[PDB]
Amino acid sequence: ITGRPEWIWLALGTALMGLGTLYFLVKGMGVSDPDAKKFYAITTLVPAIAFTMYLSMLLGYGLTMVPFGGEQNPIYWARYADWLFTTPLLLLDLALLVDADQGTILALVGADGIMIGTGLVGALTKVYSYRFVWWAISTAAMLYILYVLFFGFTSKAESMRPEVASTFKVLRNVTVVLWSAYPVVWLIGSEGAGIVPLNIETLLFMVLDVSAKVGFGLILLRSRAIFGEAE
Amino acid sequence: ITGRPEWIWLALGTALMGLGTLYFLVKGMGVSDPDAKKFYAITTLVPAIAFTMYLSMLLGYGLTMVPFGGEQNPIYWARYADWLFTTPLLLLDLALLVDADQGTILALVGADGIMIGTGLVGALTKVYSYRFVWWAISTAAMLYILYVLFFGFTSKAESMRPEVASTFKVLRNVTVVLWSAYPVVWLIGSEGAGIVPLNIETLLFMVLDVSAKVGFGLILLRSRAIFGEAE
Amino acid sequence: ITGRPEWIWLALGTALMGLGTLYFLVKGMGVSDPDAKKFYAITTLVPAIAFTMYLSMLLGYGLTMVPFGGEQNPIYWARYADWLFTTPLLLLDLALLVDADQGTILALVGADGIMIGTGLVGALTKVYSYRFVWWAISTAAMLYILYVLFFGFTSKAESMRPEVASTFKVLRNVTVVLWSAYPVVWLIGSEGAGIVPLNIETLLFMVLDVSAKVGFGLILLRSRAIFGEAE
Ligand SMILES: CC(C)CCC[C@@H](C)CCC[C@@H](C)CCC[C@@H](C)CCOC[C@@H](CO)OCC[C@H](C)CCC[C@H](C)CCC[C@H](C)CCCC(C)C
Ligand SMILES: CC(C)CCC[C@@H](C)CCC[C@@H](C)CCC[C@@H](C)CCOC[C@@H](CO)OCC[C@H](C)CCC[C@H](C)CCC[C@H](C)CCCC(C)C
Ligand SMILES: CC(C)CCC[C@@H](C)CCC[C@@H](C)CCC[C@@H](C)CCOC[C@@H](CO)OCC[C@H](C)CCC[C@H](C)CCC[C@H](C)CCCC(C)C
Ligand SMILES: *C/C=C(C)/C=C/C=C(C)/C=C/C1=C(C)CCCC1(C)C
Ligand SMILES: *C/C=C(C)/C=C/C=C(C)/C=C/C1=C(C)CCCC1(C)C
Ligand SMILES: *C/C=C(C)/C=C/C=C(C)/C=C/C1=C(C)CCCC1(C)C
Ligand SMILES: CCCCCCCCCCCCCCC
Ligand SMILES: CCCCCCCCCCCCCCC
Ligand SMILES: CCCCCCCCCCCCCCC
Ligand SMILES: CCCCCCCCCCCCCC
Ligand SMILES: CCCCCCCCCCCCCC
Ligand SMILES: CCCCCCCCCCCCCC
Ligand SMILES: CCCCCCCCCCCCC
Ligand SMILES: CCCCCCCCCCCCC
Ligand SMILES: CCCCCCCCCCCCC
Ligand SMILES: CCCCCCCCCCC
Ligand SMILES: CCCCCCCCCCC
Ligand SMILES: CCCCCCCCCCC
Ligand SMILES: CCCCCCCCCCC
Ligand SMILES: CCCCCCCCCC
Ligand SMILES: CCCCCCCCCC
Ligand SMILES: CCCCCCCCCC
Ligand SMILES: CCCCCCCCC
Ligand SMILES: CCCCCCCCC
Ligand SMILES: CCCCCCCCC
Ligand SMILES: CCCCCCCC
Ligand SMILES: CCCCCCCC
Ligand SMILES: CCCCCCCC
Ligand SMILES: CCCCCCCC
Ligand SMILES: CCCCCCCC
Ligand SMILES: CCCCCCCC
Ligand SMILES: CCCCCCCC
Ligand SMILES: CCCCCCCC
Ligand SMILES: CCCCCCCC
Numbered sequence: 271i272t273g274r275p276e277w278i279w280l281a282l283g284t285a286l287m288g289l290g291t292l293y294f295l296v297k298g299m300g301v302s303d304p305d306a307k308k309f310y311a312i313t314t315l316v317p318a319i320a321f322t323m324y325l326s327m328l329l330g331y332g333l334t335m336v337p338f339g340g341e342q343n344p345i346y347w348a349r350y351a352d353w354l355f356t357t358p359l360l361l362l363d364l365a366l367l368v369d370a371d372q373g374t375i376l377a378l379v380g381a382d383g384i385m386i387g388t389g390l391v392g393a394l395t396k397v398y399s400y401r402f403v404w405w406a407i408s409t410a411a412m413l414y415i416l417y418v419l420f421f422g423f424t425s426k427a428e429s430m431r432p433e434v435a436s437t438f439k440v441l442r443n444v445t446v447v448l449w450s451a452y453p454v455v456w457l458i459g460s461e462g463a464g465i466v467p468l469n470i471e472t473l474l475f476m477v478l479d480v481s482a483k484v485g486f487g488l489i490l491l492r493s494r495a496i497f498g499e500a501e
Numbered sequence: 502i503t504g505r506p507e508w509i510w511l512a513l514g515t516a517l518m519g520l521g522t523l524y525f526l527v528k529g530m531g532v533s534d535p536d537a538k539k540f541y542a543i544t545t546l547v548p549a550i551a552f553t554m555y556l557s558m559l560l561g562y563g564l565t566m567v568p569f570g571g572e573q574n575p576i577y578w579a580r581y582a583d584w585l586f587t588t589p590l591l592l593l594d595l596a597l598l599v600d601a602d603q604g605t606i607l608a609l610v611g612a613d614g615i616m617i618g619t620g621l622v623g624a625l626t627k628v629y630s631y632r633f634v635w636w637a638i639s640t641a642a643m644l645y646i647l648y649v650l651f652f653g654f655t656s657k658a659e660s661m662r663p664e665v666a667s668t669f670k671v672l673r674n675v676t677v678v679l680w681s682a683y684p685v686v687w688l689i690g691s692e693g694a695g696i697v698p699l700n701i702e703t704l705l706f707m708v709l710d711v712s713a714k715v716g717f718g719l720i721l722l723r724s725r726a727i728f729g730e731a732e
Numbered sequence: 733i734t735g736r737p738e739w740i741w742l743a744l745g746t747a748l749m750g751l752g753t754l755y756f757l758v759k760g761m762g763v764s765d766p767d768a769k770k771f772y773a774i775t776t777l778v779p780a781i782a783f784t785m786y787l788s789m790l791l792g793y794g795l796t797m798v799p800f801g802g803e804q805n806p807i808y809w810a811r812y813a814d815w816l817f818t819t820p821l822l823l824l825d826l827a828l829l830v831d832a833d834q835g836t837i838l839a840l841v842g843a844d845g846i847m848i849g850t851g852l853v854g855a856l857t858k859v860y861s862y863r864f865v866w867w868a869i870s871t872a873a874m875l876y877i878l879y880v881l882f883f884g885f886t887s888k889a890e891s892m893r894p895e896v897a898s899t900f901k902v903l904r905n906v907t908v909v910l911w912s913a914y915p916v917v918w919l920i921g922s923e924g925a926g927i928v929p930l931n932i933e934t935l936l937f938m939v940l941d942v943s944a945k946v947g948f949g950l951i952l953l954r955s956r957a958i959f960g961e962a963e
Pocket of ligand 31: 685
């Protein structure tokens with residue numbers, strides 16, 4: 271395990287996701303409100319899935335070698351397995367907060383699936399120049415998602431409770447900033463142009479992942495917006 | 502890319518799915534009705550997914566070699582990745598049109614999953630005679646789906662709005678004819694008996710795919726059946 | 733096929749799932765009640781999926797070799813493909829019976845996904861001692877599911893119809909006993925410590941699978957709890 275310099279960040283990531291999972295699990299024990307239960311379920315599952323995939327990367331299972339540029343390049347494929355399930359759960363948290371219509375939710379989840387799926391294909395593609403074609407398609411799917419979060423959701427939040435409108439606005443802003451960093455790190459890291467070494471890349475993704483999951487969850491689950499308006 | 506004679510049909514397929522995706526995306530921009538949004542979301546996602554998988558076939562990612570009959574046989578596995586997601590979306594379009602009950606929708610999607618999954622296993626099976634066992638099981642799942650579309654849905658459409666009944670009937674008929682061709686092409690093509698060469702097989706699937714997705718979508722999204730009855 | 737001593741149990745399993753599938757399919761033909769249709773759909777799909785995966789194991793497709801302990805160890809990976817889809821369907825049968833809230837259903841299905849997914853990783857892991865780390869995480873996800881079935885569902889059933897409360901209690905008890913055997917068989921069988929040989933392991937899983945699917949389904953589909961209260 272320690273044979274890879276990036277192991278320290280995989281281990282820290284595993285620990286922080288594990289701790290985040292346990293914290294949300296305990297916190298949600300005292301919850302009976304049916305609406306709050308939905309948000310706790312979604313939000314606890316996110317770091318639990320990430321915990322398993324960080325562990326698989328730490329132990330070496332979630333790593334494969336991909337030939338491109340005349341080299342055997344270490345590619346952590348387990349990231350995409352994580353993201354396939356956790357990024358639509360994160361979007362679902364946002365969509366339920368603002369009572370999004372079903373068509374909009376399906377558009378978001380579908381675009382998200384395309385985003386992660388094409389990122390996976392790009393990560394595993396052996397023809398170097400083609401990796402960036404997949405990156406571009408994935409990034410276009412991301413831009414669609416960000417567009418919807420701003421010009422379909424923000425003006426939906428404003429007709430809702432003030433506490434859900436303010437909580438949505440904060441989580442929207444956190445999401446757009448954090449999620450936009452992922453394609454940049456991929457592009458300059460070992461999957462793309464290879465300018466930033468894998469150990470630093472792994473650190474960067476770990477900070478983004480913990481912030482986008484445990485950070486996000488801490489903000490959401492401390493808000494009164496997750497509860498039905500009750501006396 | 503041009504090293505494979507079937508590349509021209511993969512390229513045309515990619516282009517037509519891409520163009521179809523953009524057309525539906527633009528067309529749905531001016532839509533606020535919650536019901537119509539569902540149909541636009543579902544129907545736009547279908548060629549978008551197909552676009553990505555056609556591209557993966559064009560660039561060579563979605564192709565693998567399978568030993569059977571003492572030969573290395575080129576198998577485009579990306580078709581099944583496409584179909585796994587797009588065929589239940591197509592069925593969902595039909596089921597929502599007639600306000601199908603939840604049990605029926607689950608039966609359809611489940612049978613569809615079995616249909617595509619067993620087709621994938623058959624496509625990748627190395628014992629030649631066993632490929633046709635999987636083809637038979639998949640075809641039985643197809644026949645179940647077609648049965649339900651006729652003797653569970655058609656008589657559901659008739660108690661609904663005339664515009665939804667007439668639109669459903671047309672899309673049902675398009676679906677049954679087009680979908681029934683797929684097992685025949687598989688059986689006589691490079692996956693099955695090998696009587697029709699891969700380049701012609703690829704052409705045939707491209708025509709079926711564009712018709713079943715973009716053709717289907719053009720009929721559906723031009724109907725007033727996708728809108729709630731409103732003043 | 734007969735080259736593997738466990739083939740007889742794979743063949744019997746295939747037959748019993750096939751027969752169970754046909755029986756439930758015929759039985760549900762005379763059903764119009766929308767609630768009952770949901771239970772028939774879910775419950776018929778379960779042995780149908782299991783039938784396909786038992787067949788893939790019989791024909792040899794669903795088997796791979798995994799190096800650990802200095803040996804090439806036969807691992808039937810198709811079990812996890814089965815279980816990935818059938819265990820959440822089984823939980824859905826239980827959850828719908830007691831009209832579980834959406835948050836609880838998502839927690840169950842999510843924990844179940846983690847349970848099966850980590851079992852799959854453990855089954856395919858090449859570092860022997862690490863296989864048991866994945867077994868432990870999977871078992872913890874199982875224990876969460878069993879906890880919810882007892883201390884979240886049982887007291888939900890009691891405020892419902894007596895026929896649904898009594899049917900739920902029986903199916904809950906069947907589920908907890910049968911499902912708890914699976915991690916034990918894995919641990920002592922060819923995936924784990926290797927004390928019980930593969931042919932006996934295969935027998936054990938076949939008895940558990942038929943009981944947990946066809947047995948379970950026979951109890952559920954003969955109950956009046958699956959019908960809406962109607963005059
Ligand atoms: C509604 C939304 C969910 C829409 C989803 C959007 C989605 C369509 C976007 C594209 C997803 C698609 C790229 C998934 C591809 C998975 C694939 C990378 C798995 C690895 O297999 C690739 C090659 C080795 O590089 O296998 C070597 C050759 C092997 C023989 C491969 C044969 C097995 C195939 C992988 C079977 C395909 C199954 C499905 C792709 C399962 C989806 C997995 C998940 C990653 C989407
Ligand atoms: C409700 C509905 C959705 C019901 C669904 C119906 C469904 C059950 C029908 C059968 C689906 C099943 C056949 C999927 C099999 C996928 C498999 C072909 C992927 C390729 O792996 C096959 C071999 C190489 O040929 O791998 C070589 C050996 C490798 C070590 C394989 C180990 C990895 C396994 C593939 C893990 C299994 C994961 C699940 C099958 C994911 C499902 C993918 C999708 C195609 C259904
Ligand atoms: C809401 C709930 C559903 C939550 C779900 C919980 C879930 C997160 C729990 C963990 C699931 C995760 C372990 C699935 C891993 C599948 C993996 C074993 C498939 C086989 O690939 C493993 C190695 C060979 O051993 O591939 C060799 C290297 C290859 C290059 C691998 C590259 C292809 C990757 C497999 C692509 C990943 C796609 C997704 C994992 C699809 C999920 C399949 C299913 C088994 C969950
Ligand atoms: C918890 C994990 C999260 C929130 C991950 C988010 C990841 C993305 C938004 C990834 C986006 C990518 C692209 C837009 C193109 C390049 C490849 C990706 C997959 C890194
Ligand atoms: C957009 C793509 C569509 C609508 C594809 C539909 C495909 C089918 C109905 C495929 C059916 C098959 C069988 C019935 C058995 C042989 C294998 C298949 C998968 C080709
Ligand atoms: C129809 C099949 C059923 C109901 C299978 C149930 C399987 C399980 C509950 C498996 C559990 C496992 C663990 C808890 C850890 C070890 C690995 C598994 C996957 C066997
Ligand atoms: C969105 C953030 C992307 C920028 C990442 C900056 C990383 C700087 C680290 C120094 C680069 C290491 C190069 C020498 C090894
Ligand atoms: C459902 C349509 C299946 C029939 C396809 C007919 C294809 C005819 C093309 C000629 C066959 C090529 C054989 C000589 C290369
Ligand atoms: C939950 C049941 C696990 C116990 C399984 C008992 C199997 C006993 C069979 C005898 C073991 C075979 C060892 C000699 C080959
Ligand atoms: C490819 C995996 C996509 C599914 C991820 C799980 C999250 C799905 C959330 C469903 C949202 C509800 C839509 C109506
Ligand atoms: C194996 C992939 C199956 C899921 C495909 C995505 C479409 C699912 C549509 C869900 C229909 C709603 C059922 C209640
Ligand atoms: C990884 C596969 C998980 C999906 C299995 C299919 C069963 C899903 C049942 C959905 C229950 C409804 C939740 C709201
Ligand atoms: C186009 C929608 C406006 C809100 C999205 C902001 C786009 C940020 C760009 C992210 C950088 C990705 C490379
Ligand atoms: C049995 C349901 C009647 C409607 C379905 C028509 C079946 C068409 C056969 C398709 C050919 C597949 C090989
Ligand atoms: C902790 C919840 C109480 C009900 C679950 C009973 C646990 C049975 C243990 C199963 C054995 C697995 C190794
Ligand atoms: C070796 C790099 C070749 C450049 C490929 C860039 C493609 C980016 C596509 C953006 C439309
Ligand atoms: C080499 C071909 C052997 C014939 C197999 C046909 C099987 C079809 C099954 C239909 C019930
Ligand atoms: C070779 C076996 C080494 C023992 C591993 C047991 C790990 C079990 C983890 C339970 C917390
Ligand atoms: C990680 C295993 C958890 C099993 C005990 C249940 C913890 C309490 C959860 C309350 C919903
Ligand atoms: C509760 C702490 C969980 C941390 C387990 C994984 C950390 C890796 C240590 C090497
Ligand atoms: C908008 C046109 C999209 C076409 C891109 C793929 C066509 C392949 C050209 C070689
Ligand atoms: C209807 C009987 C189904 C049995 C088919 C599979 C049994 C395997 C026989 C070798
Ligand atoms: C993006 C950083 C999130 C910070 C989380 C802090 C949570 C405290 C309530
Ligand atoms: C099956 C062929 C469909 C033809 C689509 C034409 C759409 C015009 C409205
Ligand atoms: C766990 C054993 C189940 C027994 C099923 C018998 C069904 C008869 C109604
Ligand atoms: C990591 C366990 C958290 C302890 C409880 C925190 C207050 C709910
Ligand atoms: C008003 C919300 C500001 C949140 C910005 C957080 C940036 C990481
Ligand atoms: C809305 C601001 C987006 C900031 C992008 C930051 C990418 C590192
Ligand atoms: C391909 C872009 C379509 C242009 C608009 C068509 C009329 C909505
Ligand atoms: C009355 C609907 C006829 C549609 C037939 C289309 C055949 C491709
Ligand atoms: C309902 C008519 C089906 C026609 C099947 C055509 C197959 C090529
Ligand atoms: C296996 C076929 C079952 C025959 C009908 C049983 C009574 C519904
Ligand atoms: C009162 C229900 C008892 C069911 C026990 C079944 C054990 C296999
Ligand atoms: C509730 C009793 C569980 C019995 C476990 C049996 C495991 C073989």
